[PDB]
Design a protein around this ligand. Structure first.
Ligand SMILES: C[S@@+](CC[C@H](N)C(=O)[O-])C[C@H]1O[C@@H](n2cnc3c(N)ncnc32)[C@H](O)[C@@H]1O
Ligand code: SF4
Ligand code: SF4
Ligand code: SF4
Ligand SMILES: [Cl-]
Length: 381
């Protein structure tokens, strides 16, 4: 089929220590496999190019993927050029904290048509509250520097903003900052508490009541801009529009059930979702097994099967066709247990009662522009 992989080329290694981050190697309660060896990179690229049909996608995350260094990415591009025997279209993307981006990176990413996700939580004070370096110092100016480089070198990028309780209290400041910077492709990621911990216990924790307030305020700002002919693409609202018009969404977590994301750690180990890079969900190694073999594992089958359970409340919900129960990670409360109701169920219900009337209007407005914006959240065209 088409194949899409999420690769951690520096594993969980990172130069920052964001308060809410459970992905980095120096973080809460996460082993690092170091930098992906040339041999593992080559194995992975050739395998995807031989086994994919239609197209394939390589997404580089972590950890901070720029820690693998620019040479790693140059070798990636040489492998893609040499070994794409089927002449597939290849999509490449990079999610980065931005702090190591310089002119050499910006030129490389522009020249090689990468789609970049740049993590920025809002204006200076909001961003710096949680996104601190390993010495505990500020990072916002370095991220702004990366965004300016991306603008100068015409790199395609989205902003990835984590929604903490602070974000929810200050939607106006966040939305206005991104507007001033002319960042028109935004993705708001709900702050997740560490897996299987009791939810809502940290000062940054996004509780359901906070998330309701966030969604309603953000929608009002977005809709106002829409009425005034300023198009701002917000990934969730666009996913709602595409669910309304197409019956399905391009975003994992909006379609009711899980997919195998083919997360590849730097040792070549494979996992089904980036929220689940854990030994009990380790599918195998990409050096040893085909993508089909990995997908066909008992572990993958089970991971996907667990998400098909529909909560009883959802079956009767007026918004079910719109929401579909949300992302499995937001339903996974306890180790080895059946999924519960989405943590944010109440938030979605209240937001939908507030926003559904206006959502249709925009849905009736759209068309090619909506599909194109939605694609920008997924891959470089
Ligand atoms: C894990 S980072 C990896 C790439 C890179 N280091 C960066 O910051 O963009 C990927 C995205 O996940 C987000 N993230 C980190 N901790 C999170 C959490 N607890 N809940 C939701 N997203 C989180 C980050 O802010 C970032 O936007
Ligand atoms: S920069 Fe990215 S990986 Fe590193 S600590 Fe922050 S969110 Fe986590
Ligand atoms: S947990 Fe969420 S993001 Fe991961 S595969 Fe399932 S729906 Fe997708
Ligand atoms: S709003 Fe709540 S009950 Fe309705 S589909 Fe979503 S999670 Fe299920
Ligand atoms: Cl979003």
């Amino acid at each position: 089929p088409p194949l899409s992989l999420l690769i951690k080329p520096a594993s969980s290694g990172c130069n920052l220590k964001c308060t809410y981050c459970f992905y980095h190697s120096l973080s809460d309660n996460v082993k690092s496999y170091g930098i992906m060896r040339d041999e593992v990179l080559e194995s992975m690229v050739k395998r995807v190019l031989n086994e994919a049909n239609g197209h394939c996608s390589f997404a580089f995350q972590g950890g901070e993927p720029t820690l693998a260094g620019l040479e790693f990415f140059e070798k990636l591009m040489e492998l893609q050029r040499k070994h794409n025997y089927k002449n597939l279209k290849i999509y490449n993307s990079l999610q980065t904290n931005g702090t190591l981006i310089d002119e050499s990176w910006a030129k490389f990413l522009s020249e090689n048509k990468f789609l970049v996700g740049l993590s920025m939580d809002g204006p200076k004070e909001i961003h710096n509250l949680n996104r601190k370096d390993c010495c505990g110092l500020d990072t916002f100016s370095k991220v702004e520097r990366a965004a300016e480089l991306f603008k100068k070198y015409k790199v395609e990028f989205n902003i990835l903003c984590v929604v903490t309780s602070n974000t929810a209290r200050h939607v106006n400041k966040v939305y206005k900052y991104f507007k001033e910077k002319d960042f028109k492709f935004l993705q708001f990621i709900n702050c997740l508490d560490p897996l299987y911990e009791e939810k809502g216990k940290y000062n940054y924790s996004l509780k359901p009541k906070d998330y309701t307030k966030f969604l309603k305020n953000l929608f009002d700002f977005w809709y106002e801009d829409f009425l005034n002919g300023n198009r701002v693409s917000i990934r969730y609202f666009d996913g709602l529009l595409e669910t309304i018009l197409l019956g399905k969404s391009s975003s994992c977590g909006m379609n009711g059930t899980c997919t195998c994301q083919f997360v590849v750690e730097s040792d070549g180990s494979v996992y089904p979702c980036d929220f689940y890079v854990l030994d009990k969900w380790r599918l195998g190694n990409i050096q040893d097994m085909t993508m089909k073999e990995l997908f066909e594992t008992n572990k993958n089958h089970e991971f996907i099967k667990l998400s098909f359970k529909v909560h009883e409340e959802c079956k009767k919900c007026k918004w079910f066709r719109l929401c579909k129960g949300g992302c499995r990670r937001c339903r996974d409360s306890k180790e080895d247990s059946a999924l519960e109701l989405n943590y944010y169920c109440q938030s979605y219900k209240e937001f939908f009662e507030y926003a559904f009337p206006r959502l249709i209007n925009v849905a009736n407005n759209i068309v090619d522009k909506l599909a194109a914006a939605l694609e920008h959240h997924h891959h470089h065209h």
